[PDB]
Design a protein around this ligand. Structure first.
Ligand SMILES: [Mg+2]
Lengths: 582, 181, 124, 205, 264, 283, 283
DNA sequence: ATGAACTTCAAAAAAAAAAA
C-alpha cells in the first residue's frame, strides 16, 4: 500500500490532467536547454532557471526518463536527448575526458540510433547533425551563459531545436512516440511477472527509478542492492517484482510530489501528502460541480499540510476528517529512501498528535487575552529563547520539541530547563512558558517520567497540594497583591524575588510574606485585601512547608502554578466568587 | 438595536445603523451589484455579511469602541458564514461563507491562512450567540430565507452546465466584491 | 491544612501570630495597622523582638473583644499554640522563617473557617 | 484447520518493495504466517497453508533503524568488519501485533510412509498447545518472537471490526515450486489481501 | 550439538548510558515511542555476545565472522565449516552467500528486542568538545568547539528473550560448550563491552529455561511470565537494579523445565 | 598493554559549582530530573583527566587530542604523515594511524577517540571508560543570579545609567558524584594502554579536580578511587557486584548533604579476595 | 607566571550587612537554603578584589575589565587594535588578544574572563578561582525594614504630602563565610599571572573588605587567608585534605555566632610540610 | 568465478500566527 497508493495516484494525476510524466518520461529539471537549428548549428544555450532562492536547475521539462546510469561504465547509458554537460558536449567539469567523451561517444550514439530509427524529424536529424559536428558543440562552450552551466555540476543540457520554441527535440511527436514506443517494447520483454504493486503480469522492473527530492541525489526509493538485502537470490528489484509500468508510475509519483506542493517537512522528514480516492462527491454537491467532481490527487492536501503547519501557525482546528490523506513521510537514509511515515488515515487521525500537543499545551487565558488559543510553536519556543526564536537549540529544542509535538512524544527535559531558565530570567512566566511547561509536565506525567504528580489542567487547580505548584500559586497571589497594592511597580516581587522563589522557596517565601501584610494593608479596597489574603490562606493551606529547594519538576509547577493563579486572579470575578463560597 | 454601526455624529450626537436595515440595504445593494451572476446569490451573503454583528458581545463592543451609550475586537464575520454553511448547502454554504467570513478579514482560505474550516468550526459558539441575538428581539424568522432552491437559480442561471472548479474562485472574489463593496 | 501539633517553632509562632492578629482584628476590626502590618516582619524573623510585646499587647485585645467568651475562645488557642512554643526563638531559622508565614496563614484559615475554633475549643 | 494465534511485541513482515528500509507489511504475511506454522511443526510431508489471517491488534507502527549489515556472509571472505560493511536499515516495524492465523496443511508428494494427516495435525496441535516448536516463530524477522497459542475458536478481540483497510497486493507465499530441495529458485506469488473485512482470508493457489 | 531447547530471559541493565542508540534519532537510546520503555535491538545484544566471544576466544572454532574492526584488529561442507570455525555463525546463525535456503543458517540463538521493563528516561546530555574535527564552518577565530550530544538512560532494566533451538544447533554444530559460552557471554559481556556511549551496563540476570524436549515443553510466553520483573514497592523512579523485584516463579515449571538462574 | 582488568569506583564531589553544567539548561549542573541526582558526563571526567595529562605529562606519547585550537583533523592527518604515509595501503593505513595515536595521544590510549573524521585515522574504543557519575543524593542546584557590572556588547539595553549583564552562576551546594569506570584489558591491547598509562590515569582521577578549577565549578575534589583489579583479562566478578560493593550512603541522619563528612563510603573488601584486588586510591 | 600552585582558605565575615544579596531573592544575602548557611558568590569576592586592584594599582597591566560604563566588547576591541590588528591571523588573533587582555587587565590575568564576545579576544580561564563562600554557620539574615522619608518618581508620591518608601535592608547579623580558592599554575602559564599579580591578589583578599563598604555590606572583614603553597606546579596534597586543616567551628558554647570571637579557626599545619608551605597571610 | 573494492552515478532541501 506504500506504492499501490503511489501507483494509484499516478493513475489519478495522469487522468486528472495534472501533467504527470506519461509512461516513458520524467519532469527532469533541465537547467541549460540547448537551442539548435534544423541542421545542427548551435543557436543558443538558454537557461530555464530562476526559481526559489537556491536557483533550482531548470524548468521541469517532461523529457525521456533518466536511465539510472550509476556505474563504472556509466558512459554507455546515455539518456535519450537530454543528458548532461558531460554527455552533450563531452565537457567534463570534474570527471575528466574519456569519462565525458565516452559519455558523448554514447550520447551521440544514442541520438544517432534514434535518428536511424526515427528519420525525417528535423529535430533529431538536427541534433544528430549537431552531435556529428564537434565544432558547434565547441561553440556551446563559447556561449554567453555557458560559464553558469559549468558552475552547476551535473548540468542537464537538452537540445531544443529552433522553430519549435517551447518543444524540445525530445518533445516532438516522434520522439514522444519513440519513447512511448521505447517504453512499450524494450521495457516489456523483461522478466515477465509478477507485479508487487498492481499484481498484473506487467514485466518486472529491476532498477526502480531514482526518486528525486529525498536524498542529496535521486535515489531509487525501492532498491535492494547489497549482497544481502537480496532475499531469495532475487538480485535487486526482483526481490520486489514491481512491473515496469508500475515502477515507473510510483517513481514518477514520488518525483512529482517531491517536486510539487505535496512535499512538506513534517519535521526534518520530507513528506508527500495526497488525497486518497475522494468519495463519489454526493449528488447534491456534485450537481453544482461540473463534470462532475474530479479526484485531483493532491487536492485537499492542505487539510493535512495546514495541520502540521498549524503547529507553527498556531491555527490548529480540531478536524473532522473521513477524507483520508495518504501521507508518505519518506526521508533519506544515505541514498535509499526511508519511509518514516505512512498514513492512509484521515487528517483527524493525523491530528491526534498535534491535538494532544495543543491540548497538553492548553493554558488559561482571560478575556481579550493577547495570547492565541493554540499558541504557535515558533512563538511558543520564543518564550524559551534568549530574546528571539532562533537560538533555541536546533537539536534538543525547536527541531525536537516539534518532533515531541508532531508525534505526542515527551517534551525534552530541555523545556523545564529552558522554560524555567526564561521564567526566572525574564522574571515572569509568559503564557508560552506556562503553557509549554504545562505541556512538558503533562507529558512527563503521561510518560511516567514525573511519577507522583498528576497532570496539569487548563485552569488553576485550587487543589494540587504540590509543594511547587502551590508555591507558584502563592507567588502569583503575592505578586498580584503587590501589583494590586502598588499598581505601577518597577520591581514587582516577580522581578525581585522570582528567581529564588521558583527554585528556592525558603530563601524567599519567608520574606515575600513579610512584604505581604504591608501589601494587603496598602490595598485601597480593604475587602480586596481580605479576599487576596483569604486566597493566599487557601493556597498556603496546601503548603505544609516552603521547600528548601524546588526540584526541576516543581519549578515547572511553580511557573505553571504562578500562571494558573495569576490568571485566576485576573479572571472576571474568580477570587471574589471563590472567597464568597467560603 | 441591533447597532450595526455606531457613528458619533459631527454634532456630538450618535446615530445608530440598525443592523436590520444594514443587512437589508447591503443585500439589496449587492443584488444590483451582481448582474445575472449572483444577483439573489450575493445578497444571501449580503443579508448575512454582518450576522455576527448581532452578537450580544459585539453589541457591547461597537458601543464601547465607537462610543455609543458609552476594547475587545469581537469577531463577527465568521458567525454569518457558519449560519450559511449550516443552512443552505455544504457547497453553497461554504461558497457563501468565503464571502461572509471574509467580508472584513479579507477572503479566506479553507485550510492554509485564515482558514475558514477553522473559523467555521470555531464559529459554532459565535454563531449561537449571534443567532440568539438575531432571534432575540426583532428580525422576523423569515428575514434570512436562504432559500437554497431559489439560490440554486442564480448559481445555475450563471453556471450553465455546472460550476467550473478552476474558476469558481472568481465569484468567490467577484461576489465577494459585491458584498464588500 | 493546619498541623495543630506540628511543634515546628516557626510554625507554632506563625499560628500564634495568626491568632494574635485575629484577636487584634476582632478587638477593633477597624484597624489601620494590625500586628501583621506593624509586627509581622520581625515576628516572622525575630520572634523575641515582638512576641514579648505582642503579649503585653494581647490581654488588652482580649479585653477589647466585644464577645467576652470569644476572648476565652482565642486565648485558649493561644495557649494551645504556646504549649508547642517552649521559647520564642531569638532568630527564626530559615526553615522556621518560612514556616512562620505558613503558620500565620494556616492558623488564620483555621480561625476564619467558620466553626473550627468554637468547635475545637469545645473538645477541651 | 488450526486457529493458531501468533502475537508479539514487534513484527516486521518486510514489504518486498521496502526491504532495504524495512517497512512491515501492515499485517502478517501469509508466507511469514505460514513459515511460523513451519517453525512450530514442519516436515517434508506437511505442507502448511494459511487459510485466514485475523488481525488481533490494530496496525500500529514503530520505526527502528538498526545498523544492519550490508553483505551476505561467505566462504570467500572470512569476516565482515561491520564498520566496513555497515548499512542502516530503517524498520517501520509493527508494534504490538497479534494474528490468529487460521491455517491447515496438506500432504506433499514426499509424504513418506506415515502420511497420516491426523498424525501431523495432532503433532502440531500438541506442539502449539504445549508450546513446542522447531524454531521460536519469527514474526517476519527472528528478532521478533511469536508469543503464539493454539486457539480453538476465538480468544482475543480482533480490532478491525467493521470493514477495514485493503492492504493491497501483499506477498502471499514465495513460490518454491521450481526449487530443488531447499528452495533454490523461487518466485513470489502475491495477493490482494482481499480486503481486511475484520480478518483477512487468503487465497489457496 | 545441544539436545535441549533453551528459552532464556536475559535481564541486562544500563545504569548511566546509551544501551542501544537510535540511528533514527541521532544516538538516543531506542525508546518504544508509545510507552517510553527503552528498546535495545537484539542485534545489539547479538553484537555484545559477538564482541565477547571475539575478545575471549581468540582461536578457531570460535571466530565471529561479523567481527568488529574496532574490537579486534560440497555446498554443505563449507557451510558446516563456517558453522565450525565461527562461533557466531553457529550461535546466531548465518546467511552464507552460498547456501541451501538461498543463504541462511538460522542458528539456535534467536533473540528479542530487549525492551526495557519500565519507561526509560533518555537524558539528552548535550556534551561539548573542546575541539572541532574538520576545518569547520565555524572552526573560527575565537575557539574550536563542536558542541555535541550524548544520551543516557539513568537506569533501564532491559529484558531480552532468547530462544536457543536445539533443532538449529544440530545443523550448526552449536554444542553445549558453545551454549555455555553463550551464557558466559550474556553474563560477562557488559563487563567487557564498555564505552562512553554505553556507560555502565550489567547482566542483571540470565534466566535460562532448559526443556527436556528438543521441541520445548512450554509456551515461551509462559516461561517468560515466570520471570516477573517489577519496580519495587516504594521505588518511585528506578535508578539501580536493586529497585527491581526480579521475582522468578519456578513453582509450576518443575514438570520438566529447568530454570537455570545463570545470572540471577 | 595492561594485563589485568580494572573496574574502579571513582567518587568525586562538588562543593560549590557546576560539576558539569548542562548546555541544554543554561549551565545548570546535569541533574537526572527524576531523582534530582546530579550527573557529570563521561566526557567531563574524561576531559578533566585530559587536562591533567595536558598539565603533568606534556610530551610525545601523551598528547591529548587537544584543547581550543584543536582542529582534530590537524592531528588525525598528522598521523598520516608518519611511518605510514603510503606503505600502509589505506585499508590498514587507517589502523596504522590509529596505532600511531594510540602511541602518541594519551587521551586516545586511555579513552577512545572518534578519529574517523579527517584522513580516517581509526576509531579507538578506549580501555578506560568512565560512566556518567550520578551524585549519590539529589544535588540541590542553587542557581545563583550573579550580576555583572559591565555590559558585554552594545546591548539593546546597555543604556544610560549602568551597564549590567546579570546572568546565572549555577552551583551544586554539595554533590558526591559516583563515577564507575572500566579499564578493559582487551582494548588496552589495541591501544597499547600501558600499566604506566594506567597509573597516569589513577593519578589523574585522584588529582584532576585539584587542578581543573573554575568560577563555574568552584571546588571539586576526588573523594575516593576504589579500583578492582581482576586477576584475569576477563572479569573475576561481575562489575556491578564490585560497585555495589563500594556503597556510599548519606550519613546516618543528614537530611541534606553539605560535605563528604555527610557521606559514609563503606567498602566491602571481605569476599573479593576470591582472586581480586581492591586497591583504594582515594578513600 | 607562578611556579607553585596555591589553595587558600579565605575566611571573611560580615558583621551587620548583606555580604552578597541574591538578586533572585530580593536582595537578601545568598544562602545555602537547605542548610541556611550564607553564600557569597565567587564573583562577589572576585569583584571586590577587582575593586581593590582598580583602587590601588591605577596603572596599565592591572586594569580590571571594569565598572558600569564597562562595555566589555569595547575593551576586547581595544585588544584587536594592538600589535595583533592583522598580524595575528584570525585563528591566533584571539590568542594574541588573550595574551593582551591578560597583560593589561589584572582581572583577566588573575580571574578569567569570557571575552570571546566582541572582536573575539579568546577565553581566559583565570588562575585564581575563588569558590562560593559558604558561611560556617547559618547566617540569620535579619532583613531590617528601614524607612526613607523620600520617594522616587512622582507616581509613588503620596496622595498627601507624606512621601516615604520604607524599603528593606537585609543584614547578616554575623556570618563567617569561608571561601576556598585555587591559584592554578597551569592557567597562570596561560595568562602570565605572576607572583607579583599573586601578591597583589593576596593583598586584595586581605584588604578587599576594608575598601568595599556599602550601606548593604555594613561591616565585612577578612578574618583569615591561609594559603597552602604547594612545592610543585602540581598539588603536593589534595586540595580538600588541605582545606580540612583550616577547620572553622563555632566556639564551645555559642548558640549561634555574632562575631569572629564566636568562631575558633583551628589551623592544622602539623604535617602539611611534607613538601609544602602554609602561609597564614590573613589570619 | 564470486565478492570485496571501487567507480561511477547526482549535484538537496528550507517555514511559521494578527483582529475584524
Ligand atoms: Mg461588516
Amino acid at each position: 500500500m506504500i506504492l499501490h497508493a503511489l501507483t494509484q495516484y499516478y493513475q489519478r494525476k495522469a487522468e486528472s490532467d495534472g501533467g504527470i510524466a506519461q509512461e516513458g518520461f520524467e519532469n527532469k529539471e533541465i537547467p541549460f536547454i540547448i537551442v539548435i537549428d534544423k541542421q545542427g548549428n548551435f543557436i543558443q544555450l538558454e537557461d530555464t532557471r530562476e526559481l526559489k532562492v537556491k536557483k533550482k536547475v531548470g524548468r521541469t521539462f517532461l523529457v525521456p526518463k533518466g536511465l539510472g546510469r550509476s556505474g563504472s561504465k556509466s558512459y554507455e547509458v546515455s539518456n535519450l536527448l537530454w543528458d548532461h554537460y558531460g554527455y552533450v558536449l563531452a565537457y567534463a567539469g570534474e570527471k575528466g575526458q574519456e569519462q565525458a567523451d565516452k559519455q558523448h561517444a554514447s550520447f551521440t550514439a544514442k541520438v544517432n540510433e534514434l535518428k536511424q530509427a526515427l528519420p525525417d524529424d528535423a529535430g533529431v536529424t538536427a541534433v544528430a547533425a549537431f552531435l556529428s559536428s564537434a565544432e558547434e558543440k565547441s561553440k556551446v562552450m563559447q556561449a554567453a551563459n555557458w560559464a553558469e552551466c559549468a558552475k552547476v555540476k551535473g548540468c542537464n543540457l537538452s537540445f531544443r531545436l529552433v522553430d519549435e520554441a517551447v518543444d524540445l527535440v525530445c518533445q516532438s511527436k516522434a520522439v514522444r512516440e519513440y519513447v512511448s514506443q521505447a517504453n512499450q517494447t524494450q521495457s516489456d520483454n523483461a522478466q515477465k511477472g509478477i507485479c508487487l504493486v498492481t499484481g498484473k503480469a506487467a514485466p518486472i522492473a529491476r532498477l526502480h527509478n531514482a526518486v528525486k527530492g529525498v536524498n542529496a541525489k535521486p535515489a531509487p526509493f525501492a532498491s535492494v542492492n547489497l549482497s544481502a538485502f537480496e532475499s531469495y537470490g532475487k538480485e535487486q528489484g526482483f526481490a520486489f517484482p514491481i512491473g515496469e509500468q508500475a515502477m515507473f508510475e510510483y517513481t514518477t509519483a514520488l518525483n512529482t510530489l517531491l517536486a510539487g506542493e505535496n512535499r512538506f517537512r513534517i519535521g526534518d522528514v520530507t513528506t508527500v501528502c495526497w488525497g486518497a480516492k475522494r468519495t463519489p462527491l454526493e449528488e447534491s454537491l456534485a450537481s453544482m460541480i461540473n463534470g462532475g467532481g474530479k479526484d485531483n490527487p493532491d487536492a485537499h492536501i492542505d487539510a493535512v499540510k495546514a495541520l502540521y503547519k498549524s503547529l507553527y501557525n498556531g491555527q490548529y482546528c480540531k478536524p473532522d476528517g473521513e477524507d483520508k490523506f495518504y501521507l508518505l513521510g519518506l526521508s533519506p537514509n544515505s541514498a535509499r529512501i526511508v519511509v518514516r511515515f505512512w498514513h492512509e488515515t484521515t487528517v483527524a487521525a493525523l491530528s491526534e498528535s498535534i491535538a494532544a500537543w495543543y491540548d497538553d499545551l492548553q493554558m488559561v487565558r482571560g478575556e481579550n487575552s493577547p495570547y492565541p488559543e493554540y499558541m504557535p510553536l515558533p512563538r511558543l519556543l520564543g518564550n524559551l529563547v534568549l530574546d528571539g526564536k532562533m537560538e533555541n537549540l536546533p537539536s534538543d529544542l525547536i527541531a525536537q520539541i516539534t518532533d515531541a509535538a508532531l508525534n505526542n512524544r515527551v517534551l525534552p527535559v530541555s523545556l523545564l530547563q529552558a522554560a524555567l531558565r526564561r521564567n526566572k530570567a525574564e522574571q515572569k512566566i509568559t503564557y508560552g512558558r506556562a503553557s509549554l511547561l504545562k505541556a512538558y509536565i503533562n507529558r512527563a506525567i503521561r510518560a511516567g517520567r514525573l511519577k507522583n504528580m498528576k497532570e496539569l489542567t487548563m485552569g488553576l487547580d485550587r487543589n494540587r497540594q504540590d509543594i511547587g505548584y502551590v508555591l507558584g500559586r502563592l507567588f502569583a497571589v503575592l505578586e498580584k497583591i503587590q501589583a494590586e497594592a502598588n499598581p505601577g511597580l518597577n520591581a514587582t516581587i516577580a522581578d525581585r524575588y522570582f528567581g529564588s522563589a521558583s527554585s528556592t522557596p525558603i530563601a524567599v517565601f519567608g520574606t515575600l510574606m513579610r512584604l505581604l501584610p504591608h501589601h494587603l494593608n496598602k490595598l485601597e479596597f480593604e475587602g480586596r485585601a481580605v479576599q487576596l489574603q483569604w486566597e493566599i490562606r487557601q493556597i498556603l493551606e496546601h503548603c505544609q512547608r516552603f521547600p528548601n529547594h524546588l526540584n526541576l519538576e516543581q519549578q515547572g509547577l511553580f511557573a505553571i502554578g504562578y500562571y494558573h493563579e495569576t490568571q485566576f486572579l485576573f479572571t472576571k470575578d474568580a477570587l471574589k466568587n471563590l472567597f464568597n463560597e467560603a | 438595536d441591533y447597532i450595526a454601526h455606531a457613528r458619533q455624529d459631527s454634532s456630538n450626537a450618535w446615530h445608530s445603523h440598525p443592523l436590520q436595515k444594514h443587512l437589508q440595504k447591503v443585500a439589496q445593494l449587492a443584488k444590483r451589484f451582481a448582474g445575472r451572476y449572483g444577483s439573489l446569490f450575493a445578497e444571501y451573503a449580503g443579508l448575512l455579511h454582518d450576522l455576527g454583528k448581532f452578537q450580544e458581545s459585539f453589541q457591547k463592543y461597537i458601543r464601547n469602541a465607537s462610543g455609543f451609550e458609552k476594547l475587545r475586537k469581537i469577531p463577527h464575520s465568521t458567525a454569518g458564514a457558519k449560519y450559511a454553511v449550516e443552512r443552505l448547502n455544504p457547497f453553497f454554504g461554504h461558497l457563501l461563507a468565503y464571502l461572509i467570513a471574509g467580508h472584513h478579514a479579507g477572503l479566506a482560505d479553507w485550510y492554509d491562512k485564515g482558514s475558514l474550516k477553522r473559523r467555521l468550526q470555531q464559529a459554532d459558539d459565535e454563531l449561537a450567540a449571534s443567532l440568539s441575538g438575531f432571534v432575540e428581539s426583532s428580525l422576523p424568522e423569515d428575514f434570512f430565507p436562504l432559500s437554497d432552491d431559489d439560490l440554486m437559480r442564480d448559481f445555475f442561471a450563471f453556471w450553465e452546465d455546472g460550476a467550473k472548479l478552476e474558476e469558481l474562485h472568481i465569484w468567490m472574489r467577484f461576489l465577494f466584491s459585491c458584498l464588500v463593496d | 491544612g493546619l498541623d495543630r501539633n506540628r511543634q515546628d517553632i516557626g510554625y507554632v509562632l506563625g499560628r500564634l501570630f495568626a491568632v494574635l492578629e485575629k484577636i487584634q482584628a476582632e478587638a477593633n476590626p477597624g484597624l489601620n495597622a494590625t500586628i501583621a502590618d506593624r509586627y509581622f516582619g520581625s515576628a516572622s524573623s525575630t520572634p523575641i523582638a515582638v512576641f514579648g510585646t505582642l503579649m503585653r499587647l494581647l490581654p488588652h485585645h482580649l479585653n477589647k473583644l466585644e464577645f467576652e467568651g470569644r476572648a476565652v475562645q482565642l486565648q485558649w488557642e493561644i495557649r494551645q499554640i504556646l504549649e508547642h512554643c517552649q521559647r520564642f526563638p531569638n532568630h527564626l531559622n530559615l526553615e522556621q522563617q518560612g514556616l512562620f508565614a505558613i503558620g500565620y496563614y494556616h492558623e488564620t484559615q483555621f480561625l476564619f473557617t467558620k466553626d473550627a475554633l468554637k468547635n475545637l475549643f469545645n473538645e477541651a | 484447520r488450526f486457529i493458531l494465534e501468533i502475537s508479539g511485541d514487534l513484527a516486521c513482515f518486510t514489504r518486498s518493495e521496502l526491504k532495504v528500509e524495512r517497512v512491515s507489511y501492515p499485517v502478517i504475511t501469509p508466507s511469514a504466517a505460514r513459515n511460523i506454522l513451519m517453525a512450530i511443526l514442519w516436515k517434508p510431508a506437511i505442507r502448511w497453508k494459511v487459510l485466514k489471517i485475523e488481525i488481533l491488534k490494530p496496525i500500529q507502527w514503530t520505526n527502528i533503524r538498526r545498523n544492519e549489515v550490508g553483505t551476505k556472509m561467505s566462504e570467500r571472505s572470512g569476516s565482515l568488519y561491520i564498520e566496513d560493511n555497515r548499512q542502516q536499515r530503517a524498520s517501520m516495524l509493527l508494534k504490538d501485533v497479534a494474528y490468529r492465523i487460521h491455517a491447515d496443511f496438506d500432504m506433499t508428494s514426499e509424504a513418506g510412509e506415515s502420511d497420516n494427516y491426523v498424525k501431523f495435525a495432532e503433532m502440531f496441535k500438541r506442539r502449539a498447545k504445549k508450546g513446542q516448536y522447531f524454531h521460536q516463530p519469527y514474526l517476519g524477522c527472528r528478532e521478533f518472537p511469536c508469543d503464539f497459542r493454539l486457539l480453538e475458536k476465538a480468544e482475543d478481540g480482533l480490532p478491525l471490526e467493521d470493514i477495514t483497510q485493503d492492504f493491497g497486493f501483499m506477498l502471499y507465499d514465495m513460490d518454491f515450486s521450481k526449487s530443488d530441495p531447499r528452495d533454490s529458485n523461487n518466485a513470489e506469488p502475491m495477493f490482494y489481501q482481499c480486503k481486511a473485512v475484520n480478518g483477512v482470508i487468503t487465497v489457496p493457489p | 550439538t545441544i539436545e535441549k531447547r533453551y528459552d532464556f530471559v536475559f535481564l541486562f541493565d544500563v545504569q548511566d548510558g546509551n544501551p542501544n542508540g537510535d540511528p533514527d534519532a541521532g544516538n538516543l537510546p531506542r525508546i518504544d515511542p508509545q510507552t517510553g520503555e527503552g528498546l535495545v535491538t537484539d542485534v545489539c545484544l547479538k553484537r555484545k555476545v559477538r564482541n565477547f566471544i571475539q575478545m575471549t576466544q581468540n582461536d578457531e572454532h570460535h571466530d565471529i565472522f561479523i567481527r568488529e574492526k574496532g574490537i579486534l584488529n560440497k555446498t554443505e561442507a563449507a557451510r558446516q565449516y563456517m558453522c565450525s570455525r565461527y562461533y557466531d555463525i553457529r550461535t546466531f546463525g548465518a546467511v552464507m552467500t552460498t547456501g541451501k535456503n538461498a543463504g541462511q543458517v538460522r542458528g539456535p540463538v534467536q533473540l528479542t528486542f530487549s525492551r526495557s521493563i519500565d519507561p526509560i528516561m533518555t537524558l539528552e546530555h548535550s556534551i561539548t568538545r573542546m575541539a572541532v574535527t574538520n576545518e569547520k564552518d565555524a572552526s573560527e577565530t575565537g575557539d574550536n568547539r563542536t558542541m555535541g550530544r550524548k544520551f543516557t538512560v539513568p537506569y533501564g532494566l532491559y529484558r531480552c528473550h532468547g530462544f536457543i533451538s536445539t533443532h538449529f544447533a544440530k545443523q550448526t554444530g552449536f554444542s553445549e560448550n558453545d551454549l555455555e559460552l553463550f551464557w558466559q557471554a550474556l553474563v560477562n559481556m557488559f563487563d567487557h563491552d564498555h564505552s562512553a556511549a554505553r556507560g555502565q551496563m550489567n547482566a542483571r540476570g540470565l534466566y535460562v529455561f532448559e526443556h527436556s524436549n528438543n521441541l520445548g515443553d512450554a509456551p515461551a510466553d509462559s516461561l517468560f511470565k515466570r520471570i516477573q520483573v517489577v519496580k519495587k514497592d516504594g521505588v518511585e523512579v528506578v535508578r539501580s537494579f536493586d529497585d527491581y523485584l526480579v521475582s522468578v516463579d519456578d513453582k509450576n515449571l518443575e514438570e520438566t523445565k529447568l530454570l537455570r538462574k545463570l545470572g540471577g
